[PDB]
Amino acid sequence: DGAKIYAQCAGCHQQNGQGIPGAFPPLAGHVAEILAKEGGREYLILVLLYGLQGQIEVKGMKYNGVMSSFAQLKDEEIAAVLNHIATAWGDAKKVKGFKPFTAEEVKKLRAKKLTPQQVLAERKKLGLK
Ligand code: HEM
């Protein structure tokens, strides 16, 4: 399930999803912020498929690291971990009528390979600083 896949994330983003200041952004309380944006859910898929780099802001704090791609995970595994990060800490409550992630959303986005630099560009397209 989603919780089991999340073990591959917890070393950085932590068991409680709160991250580590300066090093690894929080997911708890922050996934809702991303989901609130038009293109937010697609963006979360792109991070897992293609990784991320560059300076970003989360809860007013700056991060300047690199996340690897997790494209070795199957479409259903990516859908599962994304549902875990959306629900484990109540981020999906804040979002009106949240539909769970599904394999076909990941499949669709696997069809157009991006670089981590392009993923950052996508994040900025959301209105996120
Ligand atoms: C499948 C497991 C993982 C998931 C679901 C996950 C989730 C995410 C998400 C959703 C973001 C975007 C946050 C934002 O744009 O505000 C992100 C960024 C980031 N993640 Fe992960 N992550 C995972 C594994 C890891 C691991 C293992 C590491 C450590 C090696 C890591 C380090 C980072 C870093 C450093 C960033 C920010 C990149 C930057 O500063 O530009 N992640 N992660």
Listed in order, strand segments (DSSP E) in the chain are 52-53, 56-58, 61-63, 66-67
Instruction: State the Cα–Cα distance between residues 19 and 89, nearest whole angstrom.
Output: 13
Asked whether 78 and 106 are in contact (CB, 8 A), the reply is: yes
Asked whether 113 and 46 are in contact (CB, 8 A), the reply is: no
The two beta strands, 66-67 and 61-63, are unpaired
Instruction: State the Cα–Cα distance between residues 108 and 120, nearest whole angstrom.
Output: 19
PDB experimental method: X-ray
What is residue 100's DSSP assignment? Answer: P
Instruction: State the Cα–Cα distance between residues 128 and 33, nearest whole angstrom.
Output: 9
State the distance from the centre of ligand 1 to the C-alpha of 96, rounded, in angstroms: 25
Ligand 1: residue whose CA is nearest its atom 32: 67
The residues pairing with 66 across neighbouring beta strands, listed in sequence order, are: 53
In CATH, what is the architecture of 1-129?
A: Orthogonal Bundle (1.10)
Resolution of the model in angstroms: 2.0
For the annotated binding site, the residues are 9, 12-13, 67
* Three-state secondary structure string covering 45-105: HHHHHHCEECCEEECCEEECCEECCCCCCCHHHHHHHHHHHHHCCCHHHCCCCCCCCCHHH
Number of the ligand 1 atom closest to the C-alpha atom of 63: 40
* Three-state secondary structure string covering 104-121: HHHHHHHCCCCCHHHHHH
- Look at the block and give the residue holding tokens 């971990």: 81
Asked whether 9 and 24 are in contact (CB, 8 A), the reply is: no
Asked whether 19 and 13 are in contact (CB, 8 A), the reply is: yes
Instruction: State the Cα–Cα distance between residues 97 and 122, nearest whole angstrom.
Output: 24
What is residue 93's DSSP assignment? Answer: G
